Design a protein around this ligand. Sequence first.
Ligand SMILES: Nc1ncnc2c1ncn2[C@@H]1O[C@H](COP(=O)(O)OP(=O)(O)O)[C@@H](O)[C@H]1O
Ligand SMILES: Nc1ncnc2c1ncn2[C@@H]1O[C@H](COP(=O)(O)OP(=O)(O)O)[C@@H](O)[C@H]1O
Ligand SMILES: [Mg+2]
Ligand SMILES: [Mg+2]
Lengths: 113, 22, 445, 445, 91
Amino acid sequence: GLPNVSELVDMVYEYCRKRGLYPDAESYPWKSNAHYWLVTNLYQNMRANALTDAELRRKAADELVHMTARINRGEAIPEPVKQLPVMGGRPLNRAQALAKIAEIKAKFGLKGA
Amino acid sequence: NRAQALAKIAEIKAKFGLKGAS
Amino acid sequence: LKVPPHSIEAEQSVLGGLMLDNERWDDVAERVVADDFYTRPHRHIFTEMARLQESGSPIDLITLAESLERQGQLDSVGGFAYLAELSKNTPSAANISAYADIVRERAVVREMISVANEIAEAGFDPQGRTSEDLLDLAESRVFKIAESRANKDEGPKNIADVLDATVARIEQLFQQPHDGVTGVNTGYDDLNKKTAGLQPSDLIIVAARPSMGKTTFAMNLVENAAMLQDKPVLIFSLEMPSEQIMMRSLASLSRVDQTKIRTGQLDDEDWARISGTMGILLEKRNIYIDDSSGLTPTEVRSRARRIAREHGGIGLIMIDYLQLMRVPALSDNRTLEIAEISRSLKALAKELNVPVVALSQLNRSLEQRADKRPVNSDLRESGSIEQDADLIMFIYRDEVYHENSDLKGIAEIIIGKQRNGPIGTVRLTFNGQWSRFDNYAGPQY
Amino acid sequence: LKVPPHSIEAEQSVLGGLMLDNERWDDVAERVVADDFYTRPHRHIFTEMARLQESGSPIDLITLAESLERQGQLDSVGGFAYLAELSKNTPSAANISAYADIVRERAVVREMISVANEIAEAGFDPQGRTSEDLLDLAESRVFKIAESRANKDEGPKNIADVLDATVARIEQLFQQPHDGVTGVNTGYDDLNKKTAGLQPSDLIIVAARPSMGKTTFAMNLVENAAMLQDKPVLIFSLEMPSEQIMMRSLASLSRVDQTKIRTGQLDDEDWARISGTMGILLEKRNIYIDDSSGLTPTEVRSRARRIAREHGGIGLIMIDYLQLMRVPALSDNRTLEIAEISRSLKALAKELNVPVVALSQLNRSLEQRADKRPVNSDLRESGSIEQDADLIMFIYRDEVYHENSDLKGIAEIIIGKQRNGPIGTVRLTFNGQWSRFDNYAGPQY
Amino acid sequence: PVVALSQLNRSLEQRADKRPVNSDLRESGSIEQDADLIMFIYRDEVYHENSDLKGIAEIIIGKQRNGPIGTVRLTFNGQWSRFDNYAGPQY
Ligand SMILES: Nc1ncnc2c1ncn2[C@@H]1O[C@H](COP(=O)(O)OP(=O)(O)O)[C@@H](O)[C@H]1O
Ligand SMILES: Nc1ncnc2c1ncn2[C@@H]1O[C@H](COP(=O)(O)OP(=O)(O)O)[C@@H](O)[C@H]1O
Ligand SMILES: [Mg+2]
Ligand SMILES: [Mg+2]
C-alpha cells in the first residue's frame, strides 16, 4: 500500500540525504514506481521552492490524494523514464594506445608532435 | 504551381518593377 | 611651407548662396558641418546661421550681420562690409552642393594629414610607448576618419523604390529555394527554417545562464558551418585554451564520450574515429582559433580583417564571450564599455559582410522568477547590445533546474529578437555524452 | 633633427656576438632580418653571414673576412679593422636574442614613421585622386606594416597547429600513468576521479559557512600536495599566524589530538611522531607560509613570482581567505573589489601555470533555507567569483546544523561548478580530533 | 588582548530560543569576520520569572579562532555586581 504522509516525508528526507552518491535518481533502490515518482516530485518541489516541513507534508498529502484518485480511475504507471545504457567494454592497453598515437603522428606528419 | 507563380512574379516585375528591379 | 588643401572660394560660394537662397540650407546642412571650415570667421558665421535657421529666423545679410554685431562677434568675423562683400560677390546661379562637397572632402583630407603628423611625432618621441601600441594607435586613427566619412550611407529612402525592392526580394527568395536557407547554414533544419540561415552582415547574440551549453551550442554551430561551407571560420575564445576547444570538438564530431577523451580511456574504434575526424579537418583546413585572454575589439577586428584578406571571405565569426572584453578608455563605466563593444562589433559585421555570433551572459535576477525562461529585459546593463543585435537567441534547459523534467536531453533556443523573421522557441536534442546538439526528432508544438 | 629611430650599439652587439658565438645564429635569425638593420654595411654583413650559414661554413671572424675578401666587398663592410672592432667590443656575456628583438622594434617604429610621412605627402598632393582613394591608400600602407607582423604567439593559429598541440597534449597525458590524475594530486581517490586533479592555469574556489572546515581542508590539500610532489607549495594565510598553521599541520600529519598539542599535554610517542614529521618536512623542504594580513592581489602575484623564480616553480598556491584581501582603489564598492580580485587570481593562475585554491565565504541567508547545502546563488555579492572560477567546491558538514545527524564525522564536498567534467558530491571522513580529512571507507551509492 | 563590547539585534528576543548565534550579529558581519573570540552573555531570569536558573549566567562561545565552542555557567550576584565561578554540579 501507499505510505502515509509521515512515511513519505521520511523517505523524501532519506533520499535527499543519500542521493549524493547515486549516479541518477532511477538508480535509487525504489520500492515501487509510485514511491519513486512521489519522492522525486516532492524533492524537486522542495528544491525549487524551498518548502518547509509543514509545506512538504501538505504537498505529500496532496500528491498522495492525486495518486489515489488516479489509481481508483485506473491508469498504468510506466517504468521510470530511463536515460541511456551503461556502455563499457574497453580492453585497451598502454602499448596499443601508444602504437596508435605513433601511427597517427606518422600518418599526419605533425611537426610539433 | 511553381511555373505559374514565377510567371506572375515576372508579370508583376514588368507591371511595377522599373529602373533597379532585380 | 606645406599648404593644406583649403577651398576658400567654395566656402564663400556656399555662404553667398545661403544668404541669397534660404531654401537650399538643408542641402548644405547634409554636406558640411561647422568644423569643416578652415578660417575661424567662416566657422563662426556657419554656427550663427545654424542657430538662426533652427530658431526660424531669416538668414539674410542684415539679420545675420546684426546678430553677430549684437553678440559682439561681428568684429572677429570681419565686419558688415565683409559680410556684404561675401553676399554680393557670389552669383545667384550657383550650385551650392558642389562647393559644399568640396569643403567636406577638404576636411577629411586635413584630418588625414593631421593624423599622419601625429603618428610621425609619436614615433620620433615614443615616451615609453611600445611598437604594438603605436600600430594600434595608427589603426584607430585611420579608422576614426573612415567612420567619420562613413555616416552618409544612412538616410531616408523613397517609398516606391523601397516597395519595389521589397517585392523583388520576396520574389527572389521564392525564386531560389535553397530549401528555406538564405544565409549561412546553421546545420539544423528547424533553425534554418525559422532563420533562413545566418544572415551576413548581421550581429548575432547568444545568451544563457551558466552551464546551459552556450559554448557547446556555439561550437556545434561553428563545426556545422565549417563542414557545410568553404570559407574560413574564425573563433575568438577569451575563456578557454584552444586545446580544450579542440578536445570538445573531437568529442562532438567523433561522437565519443568527452570524459573518455579527457582521461585517455579510448579503444581502437575511438582512435580510428579521431583519426578520421583529424583527416577531415586537415583536408578542409578552414578553421582558425584564437585563445588570447583579455581581447580588445581592435585586436578582434584586425584579426578578422587579416583572415578575410588572406582567404577572400569569412564564413562566420564567433566570440566567447563579450563580457570578458575590455575597452581601456572606458574602464570607469561598464555600460559605456559595453556600448562601445557593441558598436565596434556592429561596425565589423557591416565591414566584413560576415555573420558574427557573440556570446553573452545573464544576471542572477533571472533566477528570481518562477519561470526562468529568458526574456529581452534580462539583457540589463547591455541595452546597446539588444538594440544593435540583429539576431538574439537565448539557451534554456529545463533539466538543469529540474531533475525530474520530462525534457531531459532537450534544449530550447528562444529567439528573443529577430530582425528579418519571426520569433519563437526551437526544441533540440542535447547529447551531453558527446557534447553535441542535434535536431529534435520528437513531437513539435 | 628628426633622426630616424636607430641604435648602432645594438646592431654592433648582434654582429659581434654572432662572430664570437656561432651557435646563437638561429636565435638571431628568428628575430632579425637583413632589412631590419639601418646601416647598409650591417645589412651586407648579415647577408654574407646568412650565405655562409646556408653553405655550411662557420661564421667566425676569419671565415667571414676571407669570404668577403674573395668577393671584393670587404671595403664596403668597413674592413677587417671594423670586423675586429665588432669582435672585440662584444663580450661573451651576450644575450643576442634581446638585442635582436630590440633591433626588430626599432625597424617597426621607423617603418611606421616612414609610412606616416608617405601618407601625409600623398594627402598634400592629390594629383587628381579622390579623398576615397587617399583613405584607401592610407589604410593599405598601415595594413602592410601591420599585416601579420610577428605576433604568432598571440594570434589565431591555423587548425593544423591547434590540432597538433591538442594531440601532443593528449599523448603527454597518456604517457605517464597516474590513474586518471593530470593535475596536482588531491590525495582523495573520488575527488581525483571527479576533478582529474587540480588543473594548472585554473581558478579553484572552496566555500562554506563558518566552522565548516575551509582552512582545515585547504591545509590538508597543501599537505597532500607537498607529500606527493617536489615543487614548492606556497600558502597565503591572511587569517591565522604561521605558528598556528604549523600546529594544525602537525596535528593533521601526525594524527595527534589537537587539544593535547594546544595544551602541551603530550607523551613520548607523540613527541616521537612529531620528531618524525619534522624530519620528513626538513628532508622535503618545499612548504612556504606567509601569514601577512590585508594583502593586495599585486603583492600576492609579486611574492608568488619571486618564489617561483627563486625555487624553480610552484606546485600549488593557497589563499585563506579572499574576503580578507584588499584593493585600496576599489574599497568603496565590494562587488568591483571582488571582481578585480577574481580577475587577478585567474590571471596569476594562468601566468604561473599552477593551481590556485582560494577560500571564500557565503551569505548569512543560506542558514535560513530549509536545506542548507550551498548552491551557486549562495555566492551573493560575488557573482564574478562564480563567473571566473574554473572549479567551485562547497564544504558541508551535517553535524554542524543537526545534533542528531547520522553522518557524524562525515563531510561532503559538493562540486557546484566543474568546467571540464561532471558534478556531484564526494563524501569524506572528518576527524576533528586530529584535524584531518580522510577517504570515506563506508558504503558508496 | 583587546576586549570590545558589542550589542545584538532586537529581533533575537522574538525567537523561540533567545541564546545568541553568529547570525544575530546583523549589521556587523565584519565584527564576526574579524573577532578572534566572541562571547555572549545569557541570563534566563531576565526573560522568565519562573526560571530555575536564577543567579546563573551562561557564557556562549559563538566563535573561537583556536578552540572549541560551547556554554560555560557562572554564578551572578547582582547584589555585589559580580560574576563568580559556578559551584554547582557540572554534567
Ligand atoms: N580543538 C578542536 N577540536 C576539534 N575540532 C575542532 C577544534 N578546533 C576547530 N575544530 C573544527 O574545525 C572546524 C573549522 O574550523 P576552522 O577551520 O578553524 O574555521 P573555518 O572552517 O572557518 O576556517 C570546526 O567545524 C570545528 O568543528
Ligand atoms: N564531462 C562532462 N560530462 C557531462 N556534461 C558536461 C561535461 N562537461 C561539460 N558538460 C556540460 O556542458 C554544459 C556547458 O558547460 P560550459 O560550456 O562550461 O558552460 P557555458 O555553456 O555556460 O559556457 C554544462 O551544462 C555541463 O553540464
Ligand atoms: Mg564558458
Ligand atoms: Mg578559518
